[PDB]
Every structure is written in structure tokens, then in C-alpha cells.
Amino acid sequence: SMEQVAMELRLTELTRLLRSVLDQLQDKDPARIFAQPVSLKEVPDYLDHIKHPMDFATMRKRLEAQGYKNLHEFEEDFDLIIDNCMKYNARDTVFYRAAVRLRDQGGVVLRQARREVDSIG
């Protein structure tokens, strides 16, 4: 149907905007602490601690399959990155501190993304 095509064009354009959001959030992680999944070879107990692991590469795979239907879904995954790190790692660690700085900096980006998603519809 033509309606299905129009809905698909909306999804594609959301995907465009989320890709730009993702790039901007990932620049706030210059150490690449959140770039890849936590390695279960190197942290064998990880899944005993963290039930829904997340990282920027995993988000990018979902994004490129157009697997985010709305900004809320994308933000859920971003918050998992931060929240998982702040639980597994102690306050005095470079990992925890990195997550705090990512959350703080990403807030700015996400704030305007929400306005854009609503504005462009």
C-alpha cells in the first residue's frame, strides 16, 4: 500500500536522525569504553551481574536494521549502556566515571533530538 510506503519512509528518516544522534553520543566516549560488548571471555561472570548488556556496536546493528521504532526505544538502549556500567563498576573507577560523563554530555544531544523527532513528526 501507499500508506505502508509512507510509514517506511518515516522509519527511514527516523533512522537517519538516530544515526546522527548515535554518532554524536559516541563522540562523547573518546576512550571507546562503550564501543563494544563487554567480553565474556575477559569478564566471565558478567551476565550474573548484568542481565541486558548493551554497547554502541550492538546499537548500531539494531539501528541499521531499522530496529528502533521511536526515540524512546533508542534511549532505552543508551541508558542501558550507562546504567549497566554504573552498577558493575565502582564509583572510583575510570569506567564508572566515563559513564557519568557520557550521561551528562549525552543529555544535551538527546534533549534536542526529542524536539526534532516531535517537530519533524
Curated annotation (Swiss-Prot):
Name the UniProt record assigns to this protein: Bromodomain-containing protein 1
Protein role: Scaffold subunit of various histone acetyltransferase (HAT) complexes, such as the MOZ/MORF and HBO1 complexes, that acts as a regulator of hematopoiesis. Plays a key role in HBO1 complex by directing KAT7/HBO1 specificity towards histone H3 'Lys-14' acetylation (H3K14ac), thereby promoting erythroid differentiation.
Subunit structure: Component of some HBO1 complex composed of KAT7/HBO1, MEAF6, ING4 and BRD1/BRPF2. Component of the MOZ/MORF complex composed at least of ING5, KAT6A, KAT6B, MEAF6 and one of BRPF1, BRD1/BRPF2 and BRPF3. Interacts (via PHD-type zinc finger domain) with unmodified histone H3. Interacts (via PWWP domain) with dimethylated and trimethylated 'Lys-79' on histone H3.
Tissues expressing the protein: Highly expressed in testis.
Organism of derivation: Homo sapiens
Bromo domain mapped to chain residues: 9-113
This protein's encoding gene: BRD1
Subcellular location: Nucleus; Chromosome
Residues of the full protein shown: 555 to 674 of 1058
Domain of life: Eukaryota
Glycyl lysine isopeptide (Lys-Gly) (interchain with G-Cter in SUMO2) crosslink residues: 41
